[PDB]
Design an enzyme around this catalytic site. Sequence first.
Site, mmCIF file in Angstrom:
data_model
loop_
_atom_site.group_PDB
_atom_site.id
_atom_site.type_symbol
_atom_site.label_atom_id
_atom_site.label_comp_id
_atom_site.label_asym_id
_atom_site.label_seq_id
_atom_site.Cartn_x
_atom_site.Cartn_y
_atom_site.Cartn_z
ATOM 1 N N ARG D 27 85.193 82.060 -49.112
ATOM 2 C CA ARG D 27 85.078 83.377 -49.719
ATOM 3 C C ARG D 27 84.179 84.321 -48.937
ATOM 4 O O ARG D 27 84.011 85.471 -49.349
ATOM 5 C CB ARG D 27 84.572 83.252 -51.156
ATOM 6 C CG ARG D 27 85.628 82.770 -52.124
ATOM 7 C CD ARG D 27 85.089 82.671 -53.526
ATOM 8 N NE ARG D 27 85.671 81.540 -54.239
ATOM 9 C CZ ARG D 27 86.480 81.629 -55.286
ATOM 10 N NH1 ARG D 27 86.837 82.796 -55.793
ATOM 11 N NH2 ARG D 27 86.938 80.514 -55.845
HETATM 12 N N1 LIG Z 1 94.497 90.031 -49.532
HETATM 13 C C1 LIG Z 1 93.986 88.914 -48.975
HETATM 14 N N2 LIG Z 1 94.166 88.621 -47.673
HETATM 15 C C2 LIG Z 1 93.660 87.509 -47.114
HETATM 16 N N3 LIG Z 1 92.942 86.608 -47.801
HETATM 17 C C3 LIG Z 1 92.682 86.778 -49.114
HETATM 18 C C4 LIG Z 1 93.204 87.969 -49.787
HETATM 19 N N4 LIG Z 1 92.815 87.895 -51.067
HETATM 20 C C5 LIG Z 1 92.101 86.756 -51.211
HETATM 21 N N5 LIG Z 1 92.029 86.092 -50.048
HETATM 22 C C6 LIG Z 1 91.311 84.816 -49.867
HETATM 23 O O1 LIG Z 1 91.273 84.130 -51.120
HETATM 24 C C7 LIG Z 1 89.927 84.038 -51.594
HETATM 25 C C8 LIG Z 1 89.842 84.226 -53.106
HETATM 26 O O2 LIG Z 1 89.713 85.608 -53.418
HETATM 27 P P1 LIG Z 1 88.726 86.117 -54.571
HETATM 28 O O3 LIG Z 1 89.354 87.298 -55.253
HETATM 29 O O4 LIG Z 1 87.353 86.251 -53.971
HETATM 30 O O5 LIG Z 1 88.673 84.901 -55.618
HETATM 31 P P2 LIG Z 1 89.205 85.056 -57.127
HETATM 32 O O6 LIG Z 1 90.701 85.089 -57.010
HETATM 33 O O7 LIG Z 1 88.677 83.837 -57.826
HETATM 34 O O8 LIG Z 1 88.587 86.341 -57.596
HETATM 35 C C9 LIG Z 1 89.148 85.082 -50.808
HETATM 36 O O9 LIG Z 1 87.786 84.713 -50.632
HETATM 37 C C10 LIG Z 1 89.886 85.159 -49.495
HETATM 38 O O10 LIG Z 1 89.364 84.215 -48.560
HETATM 39 MG MG LIG Z 2 86.490 86.268 -58.175
#
Ligand SMILES: Nc1ncnc2c1ncn2[C@@H]1O[C@H](COP(=O)(O)OP(=O)(O)O)[C@@H](O)[C@H]1O
Ligand SMILES: [Mg+2]
Lengths: 46, 339, 517, 50, 467, 464
Positions: D27
């Site tokens: 993340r």
């Molecule tokens: N649009 C994107 N492009 C590339 N990688 C992504 C994208 N969205 C999420 N990720 C990957 O997936 C992980 C989870 O996203 P995040 O929103 O931080 O977690 P959650 O879905 O629990 O809120 C991110 O830390 C990133 O590494």
């Molecule tokens: Mg989150």
Amino acid sequence: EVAQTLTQADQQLSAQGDQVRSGLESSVDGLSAKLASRILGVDVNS
Amino acid sequence: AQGAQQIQLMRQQLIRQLRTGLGAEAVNKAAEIVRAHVADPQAQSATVDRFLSELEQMAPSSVTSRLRAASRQSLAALVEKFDSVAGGLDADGLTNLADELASVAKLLLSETALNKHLAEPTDDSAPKVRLLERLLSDKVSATTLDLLRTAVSNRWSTESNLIDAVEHTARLALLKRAEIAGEVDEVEEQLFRFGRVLDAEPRLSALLSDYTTPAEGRVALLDKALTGRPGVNQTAAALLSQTVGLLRGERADEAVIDLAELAVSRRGEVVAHVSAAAELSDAQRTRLTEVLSRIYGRPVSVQLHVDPELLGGLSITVGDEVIDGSIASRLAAAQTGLP
Amino acid sequence: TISAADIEGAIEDYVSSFSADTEREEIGTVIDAGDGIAHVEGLPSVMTQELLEFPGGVLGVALNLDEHSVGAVILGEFEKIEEGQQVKRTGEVLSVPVGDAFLGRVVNPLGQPIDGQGDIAAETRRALELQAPSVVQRQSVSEPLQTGIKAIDAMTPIGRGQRQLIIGDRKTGKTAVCVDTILNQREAWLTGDPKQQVRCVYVAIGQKGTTIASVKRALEEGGAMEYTTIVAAPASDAAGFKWLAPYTGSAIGQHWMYNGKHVLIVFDDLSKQADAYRAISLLLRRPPGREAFPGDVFYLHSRLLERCAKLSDELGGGSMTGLPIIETKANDISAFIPTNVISITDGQCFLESDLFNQGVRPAINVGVSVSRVGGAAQIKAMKEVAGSLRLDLSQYRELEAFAAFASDLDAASKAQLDRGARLVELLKQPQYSPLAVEEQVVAIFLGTQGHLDSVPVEDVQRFESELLEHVKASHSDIFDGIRETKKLSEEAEEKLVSVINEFKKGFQASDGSSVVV
Amino acid sequence: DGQCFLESDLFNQGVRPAINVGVSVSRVGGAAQIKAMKEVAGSLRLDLSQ
Amino acid sequence: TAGRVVRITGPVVDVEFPRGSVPELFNALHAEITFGALAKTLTLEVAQHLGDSLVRCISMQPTDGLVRGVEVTDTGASISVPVGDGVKGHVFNALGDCLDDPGYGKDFEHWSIHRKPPAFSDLEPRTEMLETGLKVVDLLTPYVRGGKIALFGGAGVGKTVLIQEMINRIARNFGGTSVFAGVGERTREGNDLWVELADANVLKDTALVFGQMDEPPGTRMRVALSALTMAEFFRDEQGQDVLLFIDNIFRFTQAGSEVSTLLGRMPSAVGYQPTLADEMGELQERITSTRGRSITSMQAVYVPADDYTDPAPATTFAHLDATTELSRAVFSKGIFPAVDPLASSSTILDPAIVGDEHYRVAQEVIRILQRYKDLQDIIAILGIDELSEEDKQLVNRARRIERFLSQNMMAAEQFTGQPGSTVPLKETIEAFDKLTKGEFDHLPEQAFFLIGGLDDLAKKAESLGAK
Amino acid sequence: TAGRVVRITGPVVDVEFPRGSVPELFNALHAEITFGALAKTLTLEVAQHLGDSLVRCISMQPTDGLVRGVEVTDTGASISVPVGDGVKGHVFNALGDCLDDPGYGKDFEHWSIHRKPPAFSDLEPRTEMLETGLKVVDLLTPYVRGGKIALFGGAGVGKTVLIQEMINRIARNFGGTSVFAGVGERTREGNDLWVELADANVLKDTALVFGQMDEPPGTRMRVALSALTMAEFFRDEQGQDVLLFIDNIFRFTQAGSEVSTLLGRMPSAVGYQPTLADEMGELQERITSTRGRSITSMQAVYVPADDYTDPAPATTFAHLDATTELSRAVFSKGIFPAVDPLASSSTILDPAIVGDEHYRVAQEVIRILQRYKDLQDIIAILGIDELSEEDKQLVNRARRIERFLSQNMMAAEQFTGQPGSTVPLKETIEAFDKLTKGEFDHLPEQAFFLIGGLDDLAKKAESL
Ligand SMILES: Nc1ncnc2c1ncn2[C@@H]1O[C@H](COP(=O)(O)OP(=O)(O)O)[C@@H](O)[C@H]1O
Ligand SMILES: [Mg+2]
Ligand SMILES: Nc1ncnc2c1ncn2[C@@H]1O[C@H](COP(=O)(O)OP(=O)(O)OP(=O)(O)O)[C@@H](O)[C@H]1O
Ligand SMILES: Nc1ncnc2c1ncn2[C@@H]1O[C@H](COP(=O)(O)OP(=O)(O)O)[C@@H](O)[C@H]1O
Ligand SMILES: [Mg+2]
């Protein structure tokens, strides 16, 4: 047209509602006296 | 069409708003007017008289709880035995018997094992009685022995009910000696006053209700703090001291109120906690007692609880039923009844 | 213009007659309170389900009667309850006002208006727990309740007095079906004859307020709001209101039904009521069972839904038709509450997400959707034309695996496949567009008489609609005949066939293919 | 702040460490890498998922 | 007239008050912890009246070091937070204490965090698309200005990245005020959002309210109410359009469950509190637009164990005008944002609002993807050669469509180094019409992965040796 | 001696009695709700002795409007229902009250609904077959006399007509009577059944006992016992063969589960009551043959989630002697009764019980029908001409056999004027032996619809 009629009616009725509020401030004494007489069970002039 | 309908809906919304405002200001002015008119004591008396007249036109009605069947029946048997004993025992023996029963009850409360053995339901009475003699055959007088034998020969749903029954018997003995003295009304009034002041002083009631502390300290505090005064009935003070000494897991002011209720019930009356807006007159007091007796049939003992917020009438409450003639209640109804 | 005469008149009338004499009241005291439940010592003569008044205008329902206290469900503004408050017993079980004045209004489960349109004049009051019509106070269900949706009206017909469950996952179109039914009742309403009119009750349990406003707006657009009442228990309401809303709607509908009127009541949705009742029961410490529900959740829904009945002619001949909605999760109809409601009701319309995404709208799974009332709830023309739909669709679903091998299919099986494709395209219907029963009869006649065999699938829908327009524009006598005789006569059938053929000569397919013969 | 999912089926196939690329994620991302590694491995995880 | 602590069990405290001095429900009480290391002032929220003058309360801070019998002071009111234009540009905790500048806002007007929802007559359905620039969102789940939007998804599927993307695309040029509520999420993420808003110059218009997952259940229960109170003041008093961002609302529910059984109430199904739906309804119904007063609320809804039938997300679904469902299956494919087109929905995706062409293209895309999902297992076992020619064309078209639904987001550069792109709605509709008509069936599917509009598609196809 | 209500928690009511006047378990007590709108008399069945003179009871009617402390009177006996010939032609509830005519049967003899099964020594050890007179049932799925038959059928497959047929046949041939037990009965369907039995004129041969959907769990749990008590009187006292219809037995199980949950009992696997098997045994063991008379039961069984291993169907099938599937395909083909000859089964279709010839003919019919079922798909998709000559010969023979499995039912008389027929078992065996041997292939298919024995077959053949 419904919206413009709604807003003009709103403003006019708010104005006349304030006017009627001013008008009805007079008879409060009689109504309050009547209510007090009814609750007390004996008529009170004041 | 919907636009014109909206115009009409908004119009009558404004009409309702104005009606609510007019009603609110009118009821506020009526409250002020009644407050001004009710200052005179003659107004107080007239309101109370009108409420008495209304009550006299009221059609007569017709209608400890925590004890289960076995405990309640055994308590009934115990009180039946106690009345027969006390009738011959007479006042001085009643004093001795009440003290002995209170001491036995606190002993039972202290010795949990003995309480459990004497409390577990059983078919036969010979073993329990035999142990009763083996314990205190000669320590206390014969009357106490007979009452205790009857108490333990019966059945109790829970062991605490046994201690409760013994304490009840002791209280009954003290009340019976008070009756012999003939000053029963005095003890009634003293007990109700003590209950009122304990309720008004929750700190002292909480301190007394802390049964973890030694009983002697609590009773000494009560003697030298509240109940020891020149204007106190001796028997009422004795009853209060006994109940506090034996108190355990019970609200102190509630215990005093229970003593007062039992004392009034001794003669069969019903306690009516009449909360008037001012001190009543003798004629008004007697009229109120008579009308309450007629409504509820059984004789009624009226306890007055003066208060300014009532503004008039009487907010009578007896037996979980309230007749609310309060003028303040009428004002609340007037305010809340508006559109 | 607001006159000042009525402003003073209302208040002077109120004060002049403010008779507030005293009376003996049984009292109790709040000994504890939490999570919308209050325990009240005292009130020895209180009845089970009795309404209780707490200070500040708060209301509760006595549900748990014990030797110690009474556990009561607070119906709103629970935060005002405090230990030591005085509680009065109204002496009444739950009841709601009822009357014709509840048409066009939005109320809460106590009947109090929430649309802000003023007071509602009550014809009388009715207790929520009045027993259902007995087994000898009913008659057979024999009158169609036209939903305006070809799928239901042909495959799972609903008769007056029936309980047809609308069950499916979220966003499958359940509310759309119910609102389509309510809108379809508009022509019957305009008839003016009570033997044809259907009063509608819409109970919204646990929905967010703006969703209820959207439903009301949709009903206003179609003019359905003149004969519809909405009982709203939004998501922000106490669990007591969510638990009582279907019973309030049922009481209003029952008042109408016992006076010879015909009522359609929608519960959107009973699963949320079951959740609210489970919440209340758990907070009352009642024993939990499967899925933590109490032992009487089935009784809850069954007693609710058995009040929808077709009364016998002695009692007035009125009826109440129930359309309970059940939301399933992951299409699990074997869950506890879906199982209970499926058992209780007469037929089920199963809506499926996969069908919805495939374009089949309304997404009714005709394979599993059933109506135990059946042909008794259909008019003769509909029963005749729709007779072959079920077998045609079943055979088509069997043959769908052979879509691409039509060369190997024998002539009969390829005909079956093509007819089934046309029929599936036929049952599709846009939202908020109910069809009159005669229009449905003509459309199904097109489908089942082979008149769509010359039309491409992609055009069927359009064809249908245009044809329905054409007839209504120039050959309305067919619709008359069907509607006023409830059967498709031979002369009408032949005239309709000729009209169809002329229209086909006129019709233009999307790809330009001729749809003639 | 992310996870390295390890699977026994990947481990037995010879993928050591048995990190499941599709569901494993960090993340923080490139902020936790030096510039060169971020440049060379900018979209390696998405490449391998695809 | 002060209470005393009787029982302490984790985040729940029983307090005994003198008769007649029992605090009202939801009143805020104060207790002192005097142990040197952990000395503090606990705020307790009155949860239940247990009877006999005892009240059960939820502690807002860790109860470590609290002693039975200490004095509990009743404030006479509920937890109240500062309101006004001064809260913009500052970071607060659930109790209303400013973190960036301690002491700030204590002289402001204070509003109780417990409030009734708007009256039903004041509610007006909202139907007005809120263009974002994301192809999948703008096409298949168009967002509603003034409406309620949710982002559902399991753990680490992209909810927070999508929230940050929407803050970049919606809040950056928003006229009115923004309120972000971090509800039981990571402190690192809160600091990152703080710095990102400050650097984007958007912080001065934003009020941040944080209760992190490291806080006790009470703080995670009431932080949402505090942020919602700030937003409600902006909607009702100041009279300006409000953007409300919540991440993660499920934590609220979770927090309640964590204490529910300690509060004496029997568990419901799946171990949730019996009052799940009712508490959720109160909170959600407070989050809404009223006639003439707009709140565009976007909430990230965690879906435990990827289970969309879980009671929490299942109950939350009923409160939303638009839902973007993120899927672990899509995530694992490398498709970002990991939106499940077949499961996501919006109440304004109908021809009346979005127009006939938009609705037609969206329905065609959904139909193609549903058929592809149906054929996927057959392709897995029997292979693609055993399909009909039309099914083969549909499979190719669907693979290209699902690739094109992915997009390189502005907030995702940290994870890829690829700058984000924005696609207008008309271009999205035209591109997906062409895709459904098979105009790009010749281009390699890899050309459709993580790009912007049609110009980006042409450039990437050229990069792969195709035109 | 009368008790008084102490606690009310939904349908559960706690009642306190004097020291030595506590009712026996399963006694019926009467309480009064006096509130005008809901005024009624509550029947409370004693469920537990809580101790200290309290008993926990299940209310048979909703407790809304019931007040604490109201008097509760002990009847001194469990729920009792009227018995005798006078209950036939009438509708009762679980408590024995007559619905179509309130007060009816109050002077009749009343029997307690809680009775033991026949003593082990009094049981007829040898299984016996029930000669219904229907070809399909007699041949392929013979019904056990005194046994239990599961009945499976969706809407519109002639299940009601089959029930009418069974009532007709038991009344006519065996000189018996019928008791219908609607457990969890929908009120609409109960009214429909009442009217339809009146129309068929078989209501005079039937006693209807309804425990409806909208009643608390106790009545739905006890209605099967009430109907069983009426049937037991008809068997043991009137010396009649009885046919007991239960619809739906799963709803009896579910009502038991609901009551167990209400009483605070911990659920067993899959949430059912801990005593599920014991309750089902107490019910189904009273349906037996004894002293030469018997109660035969046909029961509608609901299978939760189609899971035959679910505890409720698993327990029920431990007692079932036969199974009869009603198929919408067979009904759509015009074959009546629409019995699915393949899925339907019987546990006494065994040479030890029915004999060698019966078993051989049954197995041959099953084989032919099974192979025709296999050919169904090929015929439908590819056409019949795709089949071989042996395949076409078998198709013809199997079509003739499946048409001959149809029959003109007595209940069908009302719908179609032609009266029903009873085919002796031996006639059925010989007819289907001939059919399996091809001795009728030359005749057309139409000759085989809704006829009786070989005589009817011939006569209709000369009619074509
Ligand atoms: N649009 C994107 N492009 C590339 N990688 C992504 C994208 N969205 C999420 N990720 C990957 O997936 C992980 C989870 O996203 P995040 O929103 O931080 O977690 P959650 O879905 O629990 O809120 C991110 O830390 C990133 O590494
Ligand atoms: Mg989150
Ligand atoms: N016949 C139809 N044709 C096209 N769209 C439809 C149709 N019926 C419903 N829809 C759309 O499907 C979506 C879901 O419909 P609806 O809200 O009625 O379903 P639901 O199952 O009641 O949903 P929820 O779970 O939100 O209560 C809405 O966009 C509605 O417009
Ligand atoms: N043997 C038969 N002869 C004539 N009509 C029949 C026969 N069997 C069934 N039917 C008709 O088919 C319908 C089947 O409905 P019903 O008997 O209620 O079965 P179910 O209860 O399974 O729907 C009946 O209305 C009846 O008229
Ligand atoms: Mg809906």
